[PDB]
């Protein structure tokens, strides 16, 4: 049900915004990816 970022290790849908620093709940590992986009992407089969 919706999300944003991710733990680069404990991969746990996080999410946030301005001034909320850039950490995680427990393990700090301030890395954070950004997960996919809902809108399906289409590809060439060759």
């Amino acid at each position: 049900a919706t999300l944003k970022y991710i733990c680069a290790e404990c991969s746990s849908k996080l999410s946030l915004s301005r001034t909320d620093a850039v950490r995680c709940k427990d393990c700090g590992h301030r890395i954070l990816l950004k997960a996919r986009t809902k809108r399906l992407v289409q590809f060439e089969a060759r």
Partner: protein
């Protein structure tokens, strides 16, 4: 990095024969060259395909998310 489905040069399907071949090695303890002929790979083109591919994926898999 995963088996190559189908042979470059020639064209013949070859993506399934991975495990089959890989098994003819650990279990039925055989020697390459023969193993292949048994899997049906007769001509070097679609032969070299298997005998070479290095399954990196397994190494890839071993990371995390």
């Amino acid at each position: 990095m995963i088996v190559p489905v189908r042979c470059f040069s020639c064209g013949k399907v070859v993506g399934d024969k991975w495990e089959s071949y890989l098994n003819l090695l650990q279990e039925d303890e055989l020697d390459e060259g023969t193993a292949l002929s048994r899997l049906g790979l007769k001509r070097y083109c679609c032969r070299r395909m298997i005998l070479t591919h290095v399954d990196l994926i397994e190494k890839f898999l071993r990371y995390n998310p």
